[PDB]
Swiss-Prot record, chain A:
Any single Pfam family the record assigns to this protein: TetR_C_5
GO biological process: negative regulation of DNA-templated transcription
Subunit description: Homodimer. Binds cooperatively to DNA as a pair of dimers.
Classification lineage: Bacteria, Bacillati, Bacillota, Bacilli, Bacillales
Keywords: DNA-binding, Plasmid, Repressor, Transcription, Transcription regulation
Superkingdom of the organism of origin: Bacteria
GO molecular function annotation: DNA binding; DNA-binding transcription factor activity
Protein name: HTH-type transcriptional regulator QacR
Keyword Metal-binding: no
Function summary: Transcriptional repressor of qacA. Binds to IR1, an unusually long 28 bp operator, which is located downstream from the qacA promoter and overlaps its transcription start site. QacR is induced from its IR1 site by binding to one of many structurally dissimilar cationic lipophilic compounds, which are also substrates of QacA.
Ranges where the HTH tetR-type domain occurs: 1-55
DNA-binding region, residues: 20-37
Amino acid sequence: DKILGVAKELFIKNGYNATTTGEIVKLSESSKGNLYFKTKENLFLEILNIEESKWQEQWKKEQIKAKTNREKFYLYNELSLTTQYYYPLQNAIIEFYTEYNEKMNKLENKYIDAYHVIFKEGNLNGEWSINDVNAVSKIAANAVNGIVTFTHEQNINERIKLMNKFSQIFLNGLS
Amino acid sequence: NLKDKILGVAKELFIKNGYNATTTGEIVKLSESSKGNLYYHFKTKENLFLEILNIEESKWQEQWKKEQIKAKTNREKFYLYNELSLTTQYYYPLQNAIIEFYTEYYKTNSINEKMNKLENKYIDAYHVIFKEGNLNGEWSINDVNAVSKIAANAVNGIVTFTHEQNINERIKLMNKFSQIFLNGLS
Ligand SMILES: Cc1cc(N)c2ccccc2[n+]1CCCCCCCCCC[n+]1c(C)cc(N)c2ccccc21
């Protein structure tokens, strides 16, 4: 945990490659032997799992505010911009994909799961008629991740504005 | 020419060994130039890499001006541009030295300003697609500058975060997105 906490801080601030197990160990005393997650990957892939969940929990605690699935969608994407979980590691996560199908598969599904529920319960609630949810969930998720990640610099309220103009276009698109 | 040769050699070096690993001395010696001349044209490795990127955007835009003839309507151009963005990046060699470079100088605003200059140039492609689409009545976007930024960044996310998939599927999705997106505009 002293490892897992320092890593997150190092992976968020500096890169994936730019923070190595040398600097992580020196950051939390616990000697290199203690770091045995097997590889640097495993350490990192474990953090993503943690953070993806800390987000997914926060989303459940905050989705009550949404009455309809339409609102659930809008909101989920809005919250993605503001959260302190997962989405601030996406630079690392990108840098990770270049530098290297396993525990990754269980994450990518947990990552799209929030949209799966929304679109599934959305068909049950009759708000739209999407027939291939897995496609639309992976699309929506990644598009959103794009809007969050490829604008992390400019004014936060513009960001929120853009994401909502997105959510509108997308949902309107499905229906 | 020694500006171009520096750029060209630098590009290959970056492609070959990444951004961080490539030194200025390498670029210098391999291009039969000088640290002095490199400094006079680019000041830093960071800027040198930025001009490499400026060129690559210019080259990209040229591809698009030629490639977009295969797309008659702006609806078609939107579909295409997104495919290209996905496909052409899949085998883009600088893409790794870009990721490296970005996830390093994005906290620095002097650089990040110049990188948005670049990224805005990419967004411009969508701005044109949407604008001409308004003029042709393929759709009615009142807020084009926003919709462009969205399209571009939605496609970037699809391009970048899909990674765990087969390349024939990604195209399927990217086109599905292209479909869904356009069909929520009118
Ligand atoms: C040649 C060429 C070839 C292509 N297939 C191509 C495809 C799409 C766009 C440009 C292309 N170009 C042109 C490439 C010119 C360079 C401009 C793009 C770099 C600007 C930074 C973009 N960026 C931002 C904003 C935010 C991020 N978190 C981030 C993370 C990782 C990587 C990039 C990031």
